[PDB]
Amino acid sequence: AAAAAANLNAVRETMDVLLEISRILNTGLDMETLSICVRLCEQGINPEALSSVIKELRKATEALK
Amino acid sequence: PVLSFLYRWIYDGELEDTYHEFFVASDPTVKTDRLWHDKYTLRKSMIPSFMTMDQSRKVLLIGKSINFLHQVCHDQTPTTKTDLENAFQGKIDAAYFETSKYL
Amino acid sequence: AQQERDVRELVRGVAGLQDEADPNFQLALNFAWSNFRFHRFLDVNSHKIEKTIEGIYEKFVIHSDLSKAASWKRLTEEFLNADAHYSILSLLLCLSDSPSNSSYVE
Amino acid sequence: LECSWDELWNKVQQAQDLDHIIAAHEVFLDTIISRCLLDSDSRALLNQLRAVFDQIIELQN
Amino acid sequence: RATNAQFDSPEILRRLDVRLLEVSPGDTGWDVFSLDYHVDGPIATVFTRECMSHYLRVFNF
CA–CA separation, C101 vs A26, rounded Å? 8
- With an 8 Å Cβ cutoff, are A25 and C6 in contact? no
3-state SS class at C101: coil
Decide if C75 contacts A25 (C-beta within 8 A).
Answer: no
Which residue on chain E is closest to B34 by alpha carbon? E45
Decide if C20 contacts C8 (C-beta within 8 A).
Answer: yes
Q: Which helix (H) or strand (E) holds B26?
A: strand B24-26
- With an 8 Å Cβ cutoff, are D37 and E45 in contact? no
CA–CA separation, D16 vs B103, rounded Å? 9
In this complex, the residue of A47, A61, A64 whose CB is nearest that of residue C87 is A47
Decide if B64 contacts B40 (C-beta within 8 A).
Answer: yes
3-state SS class at B25: strand
CA–CA separation, E34 vs B101, rounded Å? 36
Degrees to nearest 5, angle at CA C12 with C10 and C18:
165
3-state SS class at B41: strand
Q: If you compute the radius of gyration of chain D from its CA atoms, what whole number of angstroms results? A: 17
Question: Chain B closest CA to E42's CA: distance in Å?
Answer: 7
Which residue on chain D is closest to B99 by alpha carbon? D17
A46: left (phi over 0), alpha (psi -120 to 50) or beta: beta
What are residue E15's phi and psi, to 5 degrees? Answer: -70, -25
C72-77, long-range: CB within 8 Å, 24+ apart, which pairs?
C72/A21, C72/A24, C75/A17, C75/A20, C75/A21, C76/A21
- With an 8 Å Cβ cutoff, are C97 and E25 in contact? yes
Sign of the torsion angle spanned by Cα atoms C8, C9, C12, C14: negative
Q: Which chains touch B (3 or more CB pairs under 8 A)?
A: D, E
Closest CA to C62 of E19, B53, E60, A53: E60
**How crowded is residue C83: how many other Cβ atoms within 10 Å of its Cβ?**
8
**Eight-class DSSP state of E4:** G
Resolution value, angstrom units: 16.1
Q: If you compute the radius of gyration of chain A from its CA atoms, what whole number of angstroms results? A: 15
- Judging contacts by C-beta atoms under 8 Å, the chain D residues touching residue E45 are 18, 22
CA–CA separation, C41 vs A46, rounded Å? 9
CA–CA separation, E6 vs E13, rounded Å? 7
CA–CA separation, E1 vs D50, rounded Å? 34
Q: What burial class does residue C105 get, using C-beta atoms within 10 Å of its C-beta: 0-12 exposed, 13-18 middle, 19+ buried?
A: exposed
Decide if A43 contacts C3 (C-beta within 8 A).
Answer: yes
Method used experimentally:
cryo-EM
Decide if B39 contacts B30 (C-beta within 8 A).
Answer: yes
DSSP code per residue over chain D: --HHHHHHHHHHHS-SSHHHHHHHHHHHHHHHHHHTT-SSSSHHHHHHHHHHHHHHHHHH-
Degrees to nearest 5, angle at CA C86 with C59 and A47:
110
- With an 8 Å Cβ cutoff, are E57 and D33 in contact? yes
Q: Is E15 on the interface with C (CB under 8 A)?
A: no
**Eight-class DSSP state of E25:** S
- Judging contacts by C-beta atoms under 8 Å, the chain D residues touching residue B103 are 18
CA–CA separation, D7 vs D4, rounded Å? 5
How far apart, in Å, do the first and last CA atoms of chain D sit?
32
Which residue on chain E is closest to C55 by alpha carbon? E22
In this complex, whether D and B touch, counting 3 or more CB pairs under 8 angstroms, is yes
**E10-43 core/surface letters (b: 16 or more CB in 10 A; e: else):** eeeeeeeeeeeeeeeeeeeeeeeeeeeeebeeee
CA–CA separation, A26 vs E25, rounded Å? 10
Decide if B38 contacts B27 (C-beta within 8 A).
Answer: yes
Which residue on chain E is closest to D22 by alpha carbon? E46
> Which residues fall within 8 angstroms of residue C41, CB to CB, at 6 or more apart?
A46, A48, A49
In this complex, whether A and C touch, counting 3 or more CB pairs under 8 angstroms, is yes
How far apart, in Å, do the first and last CA atoms of chain A sit?
48
> Which residues fall within 8 angstroms of residue E35, CB to CB, at 6 or more apart?
E16, E17, E18, E19, E59
- With an 8 Å Cβ cutoff, are B72 and E45 in contact? yes
